[PDB]
Structure formats: C-alpha cells, structure tokens
DNA sequence: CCAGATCGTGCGACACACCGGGCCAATTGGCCGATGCCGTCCCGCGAACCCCTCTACCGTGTTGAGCAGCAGCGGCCT
C-alpha cells in the first residue's frame, strides 16, 4: 500500500544541499530521539524502510560529517518488520546541536527546526517528504486515501500544516486519543501533493484507481 | 489432576465514521467619517562674513670610485 510509495520516494535523487539538510532534520525529529547514557548523548532513529535508512545514513555522513552503525536488530523484537535502527554515538552532541533538535543550550525543540521553516518551497516540500518517509500511511479505506501522518505534539503537526499551505495544498491537523496527525482528504490535493514529493508511478496508479472506482 | 491466561465468541456500549444539513458564536478589519498637530516654505530682519579701498614728517641693497665632457695650453703646420 505504502511500501511502493516510500520506495519510490527513497529512490528519488536529490541535489540541493539545503533540501537534504531539511529532510535529515525532519526524519530525525519525527522518527528519532536522543538518550543521555554513560554521560554522552546518542542519537537513535528507527525506520521501517529498506532504502530510507541507507539514505539517511549517507546524508548524515555527507553533509554533517558523521558515522553511523545501521543495525538491523528489531527493537520491537519480532524481527519480521525489519525495524532498522540507525545510531550516532561519536559526536552525538555536535550532530544534535547542528541539526536543529537542540538549540540555545536548552531543552529539545518541540516543533521543526526554525531553519526548515521560513525557507524556500523546495525545503518545505523536502521536509514534508522526510516526514512522510519517517511516519505516515495511505489507507484508502473508503472514498479517500486519508494521507495521514502522525507527529509528536501539536507543534510538529501544525508546522507541517503550515509547510503544506506554502505549497497551495489544503491540509488539516487533527487530534484523537491523545495522538495528533495531519491529514488531507480530497483527492485532488492528495494527487498534487504526491506529485510534488516526486513519486510518479504511484501517483499514476492512484489516479487510475480513483478514477475507475469513483 | 485441574484452573487461570490466552484466546474464541458474543452482547452491548460507544467514540466517533460518514457525508450531508442548518443555523450560529467569536472575531472581525476595513478606514467611513470627523477632528487635530506637524512638515514645508516663504518671507522678515538682522548678525556675521568676505572683499575692496585708502594713509603724505620720512624712508632708497640679500667619500670613494667610476666614467664622461669642456676649457686652457704646448706645440706643429701653413
């Protein structure tokens, strides 16, 4: 359902440096976290996609200059979902401070880094791409996909809504059962958004499926 | 041995899923229209600001070294 979509997004080549930085920051913020162990900060990011973890590791090594481990052992323990976990221990504090998770010698930033916000539209769509790669789903249970992506806390969700607005694409933040996400319902916005992210074959398949079924 | 955990199954509740209705709260944000103080400018005079002019006892002076060209001189040549 979404495996092909995320594969296509991961396989998309990227050139501009700022967009790569924004994508890395988004994925780290959404599907990543920090742990203060043995007196040092270690960054752990959990992905459930084959190529996405490699892409994130390569981006870190290239732009931020750091090394990762890329372990395949499942934190869930099932070992069937291939819950990849990429780790950064050497220079973890520097990576955290220079990627936007923590700034001002203070608490972790709830929303997306200020650098990602108030940037070019390319960086906004790159941040949305990273958010979709990290977490999200494409359900199509009934009449609409419900292209929902969950976020930690209202701040990240509303920041994603704001970023989507800059693309002239409708979006809506929602909260249920204490967990909040951003969703877009109408088919036209879904198609335009998926086209902008870079996926092509999945966009077509969805287009014909919707037109034939509806 | 055999009894609760796990799960099957069942009944109900039920938190909303819908996608569609029918009105509303908050909250407007424009400048509408009316009233009022400040920027610009046009003198008005006056302080200063710069230039020009004139004063008639009279009075009359400021190292060493290397290389090259020119002036004076001894001495033929006519």
From Swiss-Prot:
GO terms for biological process: cell division; regulation of sporulation. DNA binding depends on WhiB. Disruption phenotype: Mutants form unusually long aerial hyphae that fail to initiate septation or chromosome segregation. Keywords: Activator, Cell cycle, Cell division, DNA-binding, Repressor, Transcription, Transcription regulation. GO terms for molecular function: DNA binding. Induction: Autoregulated. Expressed throughout vegetative growth and sporulation. Could be post-translationally regulated. Involved in cell division and chromosome segregation. Plays a central role in the initiation of sporulation through the activation of multiple components of the cell division machinery. Acts as a transcriptional regulator that is involved in the direct control of genes required for key steps in sporulation, including the cessation of aerial growth, the initiation of cell division, and chromosome segregation. Functions almost equally as an activator and as a repressor. Required for DNA binding by WhiB. May function cooperatively with WhiB. Belongs to the WhiA family. This is Probable cell division protein WhiA. The chain holds residues 1 to 214 of 327 of the full protein.
